[PDB]
Design a protein around this ligand. Structure first.
Ligand SMILES: Cc1cc2nc3c(=O)[nH]c(=O)nc-3n(C[C@H](O)[C@H](O)[C@H](O)COP(=O)(O)OP(=O)(O)OC[C@H]3O[C@@H](n4cnc5c(N)ncnc54)[C@H](O)[C@@H]3O)c2cc1C
Ligand SMILES: Cc1cc2nc3c(=O)[nH]c(=O)nc-3n(C[C@H](O)[C@H](O)[C@H](O)COP(=O)(O)OP(=O)(O)OC[C@H]3O[C@@H](n4cnc5c(N)ncnc54)[C@H](O)[C@@H]3O)c2cc1C
Ligand SMILES: COc1ccc(NS(=O)(=O)c2cc(NC(=O)c3ccc([N+](=O)[O-])s3)ccc2OC)cc1
Ligand SMILES: COc1ccc(NS(=O)(=O)c2cc(NC(=O)c3ccc([N+](=O)[O-])s3)ccc2OC)cc1
Lengths: 489, 490
């Protein structure tokens, strides 16, 4: 049993490492951090640096960047670029290779951060909860496996992230998740992405760009319109723009069973009885908090009906000295949120300056082609919470997208306001640059910006962003939940 | 030989003129005359219905800088495993200009349509000048002794004739061009000199650099030590390195003295230093001068500034009561969205009796250099003079993608200048892909008197270059009563 660690962190993720690093370097505390690999990839995929670094945001972005060149190569003809169209080949093996040494470089720098940091000490293997003051690192997820060491802990931080949700259906063994998608040896000629969420749409675009000749990408979603939770205009518009770039959307369709065909390909039967033959089925239907391997049964840490570690506003479990941040808490499954929770916790605990994460008006993005950037309430959620809601809406084709021959690439800008004071509740953007435009909109909503603060700021011309400063008249309203073009006199 | 009286007569169908005219007409139901010298872009007068921005400014340059970005995209795509015949790549300048001219022409025609479809908003081809304090005469040419097309009776008059390229009086200036002629070159120049350290010189340097024929070269000269005077100094130094890196030669402390034609029609250039250079095109972009000469302001006695701009107060008023000036002719901030805001403020002042004035501080602006610039508010040097203690937050990083791409030089820079007393953000300066789009909403933050703490307490979007603005909590260095230092004195 090790000497007294001030903090023990199970999960070297976006949250864990912020908490660890802040606890150690900032408040001079003695810290232990525990993950299952020191580098990305099979068998466990996530590793030192967390889901983001190894099998999330970082490698994804690189791969969506890769996929954009399909569009750039085609669009450049309008601007009078000329090359041998038959000679164009998308080399998936070189992408993955580059993506792996990029991620691998991050892995090794974290290792160096641990090596160079006093009182911040890394431990390979599977952490679980023995007692309220003891974390046991075993060799595997199996609790009956060899004990690598027991860590004595003043306080304990659960930060094991989340994991792909696979539906219990016949042939689920033949289907994959984002995790495996990151390491496919060759790019799939045909692929089914299952889900209407961000991971399905993003991978649909990546496969769509790198697919060998006569390839095809289908995406299915059990309900009527993809990207539930996002602005409805944008949901309908990013459907049309994925379709336009050669992706088939099957809505109101869900796999019932997958079976292997005699060539090793995958035959898929939808609950509708429809069938489809594809080389890969990627499940991205949700992500579940990663609680199973922690043996929270031992110390009686309460999970929510959902399955996440229940916490209050300060990341505290029902066991006083034990805490949970990140995707394990099953709230906003973002990297910057897990990092904010991490820092607020460590300042709460070791700074006795109790700070909590604001989970409202958080800026987020979907690296679809074309991409999304959003911050705050959709109009539907606003319409229920506020008596009178104004919606400002503007759609336009960036002038370049005339010439480029991608005329479908409409840019959409929506501002949702509390019409009583013109306070901006939400800002929803679809088109090139959206993820970059929305960051500073995040700070505007933090300052309780009103619609008049947007339209009285002078535009930067020519940009898509200036559309946000060009909308003075509501397009329509929601009065006590009910839609209309005008307010009633 | 006179008209029925107009509420407003607008000389210049520009960004500013059309906003004023359109707002006056459709909003306050006024009767409006607008005067410009062409109905479409191009020679002979280049600017036209829609103004400099539409015809020979922001709109066509953006389309062209977009075009030049494919040189980079084609090369960078190799790192993400794209493969094609590198020898087969040709940049076709004729198709760029052609597509650009189709796009600008479609704007020209829709303004014509706007005038056709709008009651009490009437367009008039030709050269407007000031006859009396209540009369604008439209002549057939800039020559005041030319045929009169009509006299417009005017309650109020709006001067909005924009600006025009400054050419230095040197021998061989006749052999040199401006941005105006650059927009119509029949072929792309193998060798070109851009003269000027400002935004037009840099932007065109990048365009010529992407579309130059084989063995071609782009040189940019600037009479002083460091290009882009007025911009953040770190960014000035960093965009010098990034233009160099992409194969553009910067000659600083160098200015043309004379140009002469060589026997093959090429252009032989002598610098004040005695240095010489042979290039196919010399593009002068050394400044832009308010367009006042053709208005005959001598007639009604409208006061120009020492600079040469129409002098105005905060409400766009000349010294002649019912005569106003907005836009580049007022020789202040020479941006389209600023002429548009002045235009709207003037019309609401005049025909709404709700006196409004443009805020010329904390205006967001951009440079569509490769890579680009987005800035809003004070540079640390101007801040250091105005404020007793100034903090500077600074971050430089290579977007991860620019390891893999092989464009490792493409450093992204972020600088926040604060009033250290209250942490009030005075200015935000950005270099790298997306900067012109990041800075827009920063504009609104500065409008709301954001503090550095409002930035670093906003949760980043990941992964983006924009989240670096929310990742800077410690000042890098300070300016105490003008003097620089790493730390504050105890
Ligand atoms: C495909 C994909 C794309 C994404 N894109 C984005 C994006 O663009 N932007 C964004 O903000 N977020 C994105 N995310 C989500 C983001 O990565 C997560 O929100 C974040 O990684 C969760 O942080 P965390 O600290 O909760 O846990 P993680 O960072 O997930 O850390 C968990 C770590 O703990 C380890 N671990 C697990 N169990 C144990 C155990 N029993 N003992 C010890 N260690 C254990 C894991 O191996 C892992 O290394 C994406 C996720 C996915 C799957
Ligand atoms: C190459 C270039 C790039 C630029 N890029 C940008 C940019 O990216 N962003 C930005 O914000 N700004 C940019 N600008 C500046 C922007 O173009 C101007 O600030 C804007 O056009 C000014 O509007 P205005 O109404 O004052 O004048 P203009 O828009 O210039 O309109 C004046 C009009 O008056 C006409 N005219 C002149 N004399 C007469 C006369 N006697 N009678 C009748 N008509 C007359 C002209 O034909 C012209 O159409 C750029 C300028 C140039 C030259
Ligand atoms: C100078 O040439 C123009 C002439 C007229 C106009 N007027 S307008 O088209 O009606 C208009 C446009 C915008 N925003 C866009 O122009 C862009 C976004 C992204 C772009 N870009 O391509 O990146 S351009 C905002 C408000 C607005 O008025 C309601 C604009 C420009
Ligand atoms: C999960 O992957 C991470 C790896 C390392 C870190 N930590 S860090 O390197 O110290 C760091 C990075 C950034 N911004 C960027 O990394 C980018 C912007 C645009 C990019 N781009 O490539 O799209 S990357 C901002 C602040 C900061 O620390 C204060 C974070 C996340």
């Amino acid at each position: 049993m090790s000497k007294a660690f001030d903090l023990v962190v199970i999960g070297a993720g976006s949250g864990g490492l912020e908490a660890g690093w802040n606890a150690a370097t900032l408040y001079g505390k003695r810290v232990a951090v525990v993950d299952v690999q020191t580098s990305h990839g099979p068998p466990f995929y996530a590793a030192l640096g967390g889901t983001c670094v190894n099998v999330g945001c970082v490698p994804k972005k690189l791969m969506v960047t890769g996929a954009q060149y399909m569009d750039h190569l085609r669009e450049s003809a309008g601007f009078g670029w000329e090359f041998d169209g038959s000679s164009v080949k998308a080399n998936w093996k070189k992408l993955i290779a580059a993506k792996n040494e990029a991620v691998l470089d991050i892995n090794k720098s974290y290792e160096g951060m641990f090596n160079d940091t006093e009182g911040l000490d890394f431990f390979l293997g599977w952490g679980s909860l023995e007692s309220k003051n003891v974390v046991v690192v075993r060799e595997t997820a199996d609790p009956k496996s060899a004990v690598k060491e027991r860590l004595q802990a003043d306080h304990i931080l659960l930060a094991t992230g989340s994991w792909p949700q696979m539906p219990a259906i016949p042939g689920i063994e033949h289907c994959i998740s984002s995790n495996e998608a990151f390491y496919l040896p060759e790019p799939p000629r045909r692929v089914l992405t299952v889900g209407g969420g961000f991971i399905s749409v993003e991978f649909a675009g990546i496969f769509n760009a790198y697919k060998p000749p006569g390839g095809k990408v289908t995406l299915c979603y059990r309900n009527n319109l993809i990207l539930r939770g996002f602005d409805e205009t944008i949901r309908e518009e990013v459907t049309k723009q994925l379709t336009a770039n050669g992706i088939e959307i099957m809505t109101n369709e869900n796999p019932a069973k997958v079976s292997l065909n005699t060539d090793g390909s995958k035959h898929v039967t939808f609950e509708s009885g429809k069938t489809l033959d594809v080389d890969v089925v990627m499940m991205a239907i949700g992500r579940i908090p990663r609680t199973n391997d922690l043996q929270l049964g031992n110390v009686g840490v309460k999970l929510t009906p959902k399955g996440g570690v229940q916490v209050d506003e300060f990341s505290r479990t029902n066991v006083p000295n034990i805490y949970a941040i990140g995707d394990i808490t099953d709230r906003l499954m973002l990297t910057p949120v897990a990092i904010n929770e991490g820092a607020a916790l460590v300042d709460t605990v070791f700074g006795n300056k109790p700070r909590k994460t604001d989970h409202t008006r958080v800026a987020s993005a979907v690296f679809s082609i074309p991409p999304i950037g959003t911050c705050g309430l959709i109009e539907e959620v606003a319409a229920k919470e506020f008596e009178k809601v104004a919606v400002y809406m503007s759609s336009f084709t960036p002038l370049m997208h005339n010439i480029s021959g991608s005329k479908y690439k409409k840019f959409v800008a929506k501002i949702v306001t509390n019409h009583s004071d013109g306070t901006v509740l939400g800002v929803h953007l679809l088109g090139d640059g959206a993820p970059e435009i929305i960051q500073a909109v995040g700070v505007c909503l933090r300052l309780n910006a009103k619609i008049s603060d947007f339209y009285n700021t002078i535009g930067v011309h020519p940009t898509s962003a200036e559309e946000l400063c060009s909308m003075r008249t509501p397009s329509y309203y929601y009065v006590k939940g009910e839609k209309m073009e005008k307010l009633p006199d």
